[PDB]
């Protein structure tokens, strides 16, 4: 699934191809600056080496003048200056070449992404709703975001760096074969293992910043499951099993992190073993050859360094072909969507333009099936006609044909057979923009955009004036609530704004359809879940709108069926009944059945968190000082093995000293490998132990605390799963890794600066004045290797939510044909970070160039001052090479070490968050074993004047002195109205809160002083919606009484009292049938019966029943009432309801308003007193 190479660049102009063709040449010319730098370095060490032999021969002639030791050395001093001009040439000619190398690829692949992004969104918006029905929406949004980010990183800067690495490879081997070839063939014999190890280490390096959420995701699903529903967990006493369930998978994630750390650090250590063993082999053969008088030391240094950097550049050129290997696969997923052509093509403008439209119509034998649900044909052979003004309504079967024709009128689908024709004119030859311009519709559930009021009317038409808008909102009967508005039509309305009512959004949606000025008005179920006090005025408003339009109303409240003109009825997808109201009354068909039925950092504390694993930290830092101290050992051994050749000696003394120093290279290589492996392993283990233990401790101290903490919107399931998923692995990088960084860098530069003040100080003051810029060179090159592109993608979020906001409610936009407003809304919000990214590319190119230019001018200045200082006999050449090697290669090493570790500032703010979570303690401590723990079994709950307000808002006092007493055994029910909070005392019985004034007298005892685990041990709760888990049904049912020894037989018993028992026996793998997204999905009544059986496992003394409406099965009501009547006999129940089929067998019903009982008594008393109960029976009786 990938595209060819000549297709990804097909969205480039000619300036982009010019930018890429200049960036390739700048990549190749930047490629061969380092082998030429090694060539001039070899020629310079050859000059310095040849002069030294002559010094001693001269030294034994005592009468020799000072001008003599000037002439040989004068010649040395003069030659050095020409090579200083060579180095300044390479530096100032790699400055501008690296600037053209970086800036002309980020530009030329930010421009292509900025084209492809808006062309992709435009290709999405111009699609069929039938194609949109098949594909997902979240998959498509994630496809947009991550796929365009992958195409941005795939061609962005990786290809220029690939060309640079390949050019450095070829330049290294050309210099190695034309300067001296025997040593080049010897190093090329071990070239493939060198390149293999460098390729593995480069793959390790480029994939460093990666979160690896694949080990944790089992526990992540556990956390996002349990923290999504926390009120159930506290009620059923589910602590120890939940923590064990977390703990085992957490141990597995710990083991996988262990193996990943050991593999990564052995893959780093083997590279340094190969580096130092290659140094030993090449200098052993190089001083076998230079003592035979064949090469010089200059040619050995040059061909060795150039062949080595060639092999390591083909090492590092592998992930920059990996990124282009998978961007080829991502571009297929984008280009296939932008390639497709819609059959209707709602942006094309070719059809007819009718005028003087009134709305005549003819259904002609339409045979239609869904393209998604292919196997069933819903409509066939339909024939319906209308004339002007004739308000036709249709009633019949549920959901089959009530929506398919209201969708076919906007041409959301083509008919597979038949041809609907508007006004004797074809529906598929009108311009589809014009066809959807003349037809308005109001949806069943109106969705509203998170913008102002006036801008929501602006989507009706973009040429409307505010006078028309004001006369429309007064015209559509909407002005009463909207004149109680805060300021004006700029009022923020939405799910993040003022949470409005359904009828208000409904009537503003019909108001938008009125500003559209429709000609064939359509209405489909404008009273889905609307109250009776608002359905009258919205019916009045749409009845004002009905005069003059070919209206089709398909809704509930079957009373305006009388006022409608012509009715029709669905019969198997063929509508055959047609007539007026009384004609349908005398037809005596389905309509007779209808009228029969209805009518602070603190770094010592972060280490103090790890005070148990100090036998790992001791060997860790004792290993890290050794591993970060062998860079000055390499400097001293390199300086001595070169300074053995700028002095005159025997042949055999030179031979055995060279053999000794090659042996010391190999010993340093093995010691560096061992110390990298152990510094990796021990800090890896002492990091993963803290991640496991801190995740377990934060989960235990997060599960424990009160219910009010979960009520603030800064403690959500998403935020807590982030601060539990992402933060243990960010406190692991502020205890161990920071100590490793400080100790490696303090050895690696303290030893270097101390011995380089011992040997020669007039040079090391200069190099210590240069050192910060080359340390910054190391850190910005290491930023370039992995983490450069990752930051920018978090900034683009203005267009990150417009696309997901306008792709979710795609049906509203396609009904409105207002795609161009959303496309320009995407366009300008994309236009600003494009300019910001171009400025960031022009900054990053010049900083990455200037650091390299200072890296080569360090060579220039250091060796010129070193030659002057040698030519007056106060430093040798080996001491200048030692000072340079220490106080340059140490600065690059502390740059790479200080950037290779994770960050500290994010680590310490994450540590402050975890330390401020895990130590705080609520007042209602759910783990307090203290209390009375009595032996009560009757359960007289007595309220006395409870005054309560929620801590999320103190602005509405909701309880004002409630006194309520329940008698033993009876089913005391409580029903009210909207906004009253019917379940507040229900939650207060389990002490989910604590009221301010008043108390609960549970047999004369306050719930403040009891033992909470005893109270949860004799209490069962029924929820509105059940909460189901990823376990068996035996433990989903057996969840009702935790911390117990419940066995198979009580699950069988609770299945007897459930009437799901033979339904379980009808299923295979009876109790083992796992439920979830990995299992089956049940109806509302069956999941309700699951909840009732789960609560009735406990066999409690008091039950609590909390039920809500809007079930759609509505046939299991009798069976859930018979299980409740099995529970309404010896178990004290508290009942709220919305279905009023329980108001006769409920014992003591209470009217609740103003926090006070209106009246005590039974049903006939409170119904004969003509209170609010009279109003509910009078509403639901009509």
């Amino acid at each position: 699934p990938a595209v060819s190479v000549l297709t990804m660049f097909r969205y480039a102009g000619w300036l982009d191809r010019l930018y890429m063709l200049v960036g390739t040449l700048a990549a190749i010319i930047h490629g061969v600056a380092l082998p030429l730098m090694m060539l001039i370095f070899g020629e310079m060490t050859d000059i310095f080496a040849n002069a030294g032999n002559l010094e001693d021969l001269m030294s034994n002639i005592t009468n020799r003048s000072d001008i003599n030791d000037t002439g040989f050395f004068m010649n040395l001093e003069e030659d050095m200056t020409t090579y200083a001009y060579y180095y300044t040439g390479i530096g100032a000619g790699v400055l501008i070449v690296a600037y053209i190398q970086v800036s002309f690829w980020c530009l030329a692949a930010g421009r292509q992404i900025h084209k492809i992004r808006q062309k992709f969104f435009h290709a999405i918006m111009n699609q069929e709703i039938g194609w949109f029905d098949v594909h997902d929406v979240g998959e498509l949004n994630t496809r947009l975001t991550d796929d365009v980010s992958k195409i941005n990183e795939g061609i962005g800067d990786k290809i220029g760096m690939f060309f640079q690495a390949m050019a450095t490879f070829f330049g290294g081997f050309i210099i190695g074969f034309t300067r001296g070839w025997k040593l080049t063939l010897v190093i090329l014999a071990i070239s493939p293992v060198l390149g293999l190890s460098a390729g593995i280490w480069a793959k390790i390096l480029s994939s460093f910043t990666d979160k690896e959420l694949h080990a944790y995701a089992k526990a992540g699903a556990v956390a996002e499951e349990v923290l999504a529903a926390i009120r159930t967990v506290i009620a059923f006493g589910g602590q120890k099993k939940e923590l064990e369930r977390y703990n085992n998978n957490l141990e597995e994630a710990k083991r996988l992190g262990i193996k990943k750390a050991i593999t990564a650090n052995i893959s780093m250590g083997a590279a340094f073993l190969l580096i130092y063993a290659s140094y030993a082999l090449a200098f052993w053969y190089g001083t076998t050859l230079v003592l035979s008088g064949e090469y010089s030391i200059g040619q050995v240094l040059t061909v060795f360094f150039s062949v080595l950097i060639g092999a390591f550049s083909v090492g590092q050129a592998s992930p920059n072909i990996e990124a282009f290997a998978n961007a080829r696969g991502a571009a297929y997923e984008v280009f296939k969507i932008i390639d497709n052509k819609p059959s209707i093509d709602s942006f094309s403008k070719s059809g007819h333009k009718p005028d003087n439209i009134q709305g005549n119509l003819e259904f002609k034998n339409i045979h239609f099936s869904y393209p998604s649900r292919k196997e069933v044909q819903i409509l066939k052979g339909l024939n319906l006609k209308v004339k002007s003004g004739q308000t036709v309504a249709l009633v019949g079967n549920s959901g089959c044909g009530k929506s398919t024709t209201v969708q076919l009128m906007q041409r959301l689908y083509d008919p597979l057979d038949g041809m609907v024709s508007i006004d004797g004119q074809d529906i598929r030859t009108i311009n589809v923009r014009y066809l959807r311009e003349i037809i308005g519709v109001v949806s069943q559930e109106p969705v509203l955009f998170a913008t102002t009021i006036a801008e929501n009317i602006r989507y009706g038409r973009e040429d409307v004036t505010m006078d028309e808008i004001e006369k429309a909102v007064k015209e559509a009967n909407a002005y009463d609530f909207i004149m109680k508005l805060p300021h004006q039509f700029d009022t923020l309305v939405g799910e993040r704004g003022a949470q409005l009512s359904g009828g208000q959004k409904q009537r503003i949606a019909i108001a938008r359809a009125l500003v559209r000025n429709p000609k064939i008005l359509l209405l489909d179920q404008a009273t889905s879940a609307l109250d009776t006090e608002s359905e009258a005025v919205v019916q009045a408003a749409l009845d004002k709108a009905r005069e003059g339009r070919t209206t089709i109303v398909i809704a509930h409240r079957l009373s305006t069926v009388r006022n409608a003109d012509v009715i029709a009825g669905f019969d198997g997808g063929v509508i055959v009944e047609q007539g007026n109201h009384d004609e349908l009354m005398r037809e005596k068909g389905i309509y007779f059945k209808l009228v029969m039925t209805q009518t602070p950092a603190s770094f010592w504390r972060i280490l103090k968190l790890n005070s148990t694993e100090w036998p790992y930290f001791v060997v860790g830092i004792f290993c890290a000082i050794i591993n970060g101290g062998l860079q000055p050992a390499f400097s001293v051994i390199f300086s001595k093995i070169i300074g053995v050749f700028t002095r005159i000696d025997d042949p055999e003394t030179k031979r055995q000293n060279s053999n000794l120093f090659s042996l010391l290279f190999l010993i340093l290589g093995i010691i560096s490998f061992i110390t990298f492996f152990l510094q990796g392993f021990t800090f890896g283990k002492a990091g993963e132990i803290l991640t496991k233990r801190l995740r377990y401790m934060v989960f235990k101290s997060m599960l424990r605390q009160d219910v009010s903490w979960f009520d603030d919107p800064k403690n959500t399931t998403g935020a807590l799963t982030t601060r539990l998923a992402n933060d243990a692995a960010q406190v692991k990088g502020a205890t161990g890794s920071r100590l490793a960084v400080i100790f490696q860098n303090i050895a690696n530069l303290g030893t270097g600066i101390i011995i380089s003040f011992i040997y020669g100080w007039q040079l090391t003051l200069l190099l210590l004045a240069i050192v910060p810029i080359i340390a910054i060179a190391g850190v910005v090159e290491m930023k370039m290797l992995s983490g450069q592109a990752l930051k920018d993608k978090k900034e683009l979020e203005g267009s990150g939510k417009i696309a997901t906001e306008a792709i979710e409610n795609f049906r509203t936009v396609v009904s409105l044909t207002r795609e161009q407003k959303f496309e320009t809304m995407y366009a300008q919000s994309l236009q600003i970070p494009y300019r910001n990214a171009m400025k960031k590319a022009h900054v990053f190119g010049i900083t990455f160039s200037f650091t390299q230019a200072m890296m080569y001018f360090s060579y220039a200045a250091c060796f010129r001052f070193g030659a002057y200082l040698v030519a007056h006999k106060l430093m040798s050449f080996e001491d200048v090479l030692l000072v340079f090697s220490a106080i340059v290669f140490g600065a690059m090493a502390v740059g790479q070490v200080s950037s290779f570790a994770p960050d500290y500032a994010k680590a310490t703010v994450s540590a402050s968050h975890i330390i401020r979570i895990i130590e705080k303690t609520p007042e209602i401590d759910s783990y307090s074993t203290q209390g009375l723990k009595p032996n009560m079994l009757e359960g007289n709950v007595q309220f006395s004047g409870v005054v309560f307000n929620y801590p999320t808002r103190p602005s509405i006092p909701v309880l004002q002195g409630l006194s309520l007493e329940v008698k033993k055994g009876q089913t005391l029910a409580l029903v009210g109205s909207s906004g009253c909070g019917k379940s507040t005392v229900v939650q207060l019985l389990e002490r989910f809160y604590d009221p301010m004034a008043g108390s609960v007298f549970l047999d004369g005892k306050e719930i403040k002083q009891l033992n909470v685990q005893w109270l949860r041990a004799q209490l069962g709760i029924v929820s509105q919606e059940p909460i189901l888990f990823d376990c068996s049904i035996a433990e989903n049912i057996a969840y009702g009484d935790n911390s117990r020894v419940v066995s198979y037989e009580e699950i069988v018993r609770a299945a007897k009292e459930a009437n799901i028992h033979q339904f379980i026996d009808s299923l295979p793998d009876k109790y083992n049938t796992r439920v979830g997204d990995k299992g089956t999905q049940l109806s509302g009544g069956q999941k309700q019966r699951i909840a009732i059986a789960r609560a009735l496992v406990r066999q409690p003394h008091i039950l609590l029943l909390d039920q809500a409406t809007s079930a759609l099965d509505t046939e299991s009501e009798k069976v859930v009432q018979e299980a409740l009547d099995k529970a309404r006999e010896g178990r004290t129940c508290i009942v709220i309801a919305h279905r009023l089929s329980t108001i006769q067998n409920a014992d003591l019903i209470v009217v609740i308003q103003n926090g006070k009982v209106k009246e005590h008594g039974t049903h006939q008393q409170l119904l004969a007193q003509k209170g609010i109960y009279f109003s509910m029976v009078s509403v639901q009786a009509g």
Partner: antibody, heavy 122, light 114 residues
């Protein structure tokens, strides 16, 4: 095979200057020194001087300072002395021999030129 | 200058036995290293002087095993063993380890012993 070999025999008059060449051939010419020595008729070999053979930094004997001057040619791999200010005493046989540069003075002159004679006439 | 004095002026050697040449310095050729440098060249008539014995005890790569050096301090000796007709030249002994006069020895011809 290492082989230094030299010019032909001269028959020069008194007062003129002569150039005599030592064409080193068979090795890497840019390391080793080149030492020019002089043998009279039946006497001990004296030593005249050497050249650095990489950058042309020369050193003469005490007696032969001024009335000799060496020059290199790295392209053709030869070495010359242009022997000015002739007398009768400078009729001899002149040799060239090489000394390695990494460990000179602690190594013998391992290969010698064949030597060719200079005959001062009057 | 170590005023070297190789002191046979000729050597009436027969054909097929042992010969022995001196080489006598004028200041001791022991360096600060534990090594004594003086080398031994054969010069055939007309051709180029070859190398035969260097660093008095050693032996150059290529020369046959008939040659052998000896001596230390200020008295040295080369020893032909069973001389053929091919070894008839003149032998001299560089060097000075106190450079740069870089002295050489006198020379010693051979004979056929009539």
């Amino acid at each position: 095979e290492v082989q230094l070999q030299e010019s032909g025999p001269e028959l020069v008059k008194t007062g003129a200057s002569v150039k005599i060449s030592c064409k080193a051939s068979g090795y890497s010419f840019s390391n080793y020194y080149i030492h020019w020595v002089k043998q009279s008729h039946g006497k001990s070999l004296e030593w005249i001087g050497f050249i650095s053979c990489y950058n042309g930094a020369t050193f003469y004997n005490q007696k032969f300072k001024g009335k000799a001057t060496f020059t290199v040619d790295n392209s053709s791999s030869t070495a010359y002395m242009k022997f000015n200010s002739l007398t009768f005493e400078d009729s001899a046989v002149y040799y060239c021999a090489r000394l390695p540069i990494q460990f000179g003075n602690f190594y013998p002159m391992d290969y010698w030129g064949q030597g060719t004679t200079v005959t001062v006439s009057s | 200058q170590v005023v070297m004095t190789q002191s046979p002026l000729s050597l009436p050697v027969s054909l097929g036995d042992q010969a022995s040449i001196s080489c006598r310095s004028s200041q001791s050729l022991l360096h600060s290293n534990g090594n004594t440098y003086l080398h031994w060249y054969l010069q055939k008539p007309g051709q180029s002087p070859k190398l035969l014995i260097y660093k008095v005890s050693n032996r150059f790569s290529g020369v046959p095993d008939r040659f052998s050096g000896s001596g230390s301090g200020t008295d040295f000796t080369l020893k032909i063993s069973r001389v053929e007709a091919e070894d008839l030249g003149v032998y001299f002994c560089s060097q000075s380890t106190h450079i740069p006069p870089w002295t050489f020895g006198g020379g010693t011809k051979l004979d056929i012993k009539r």
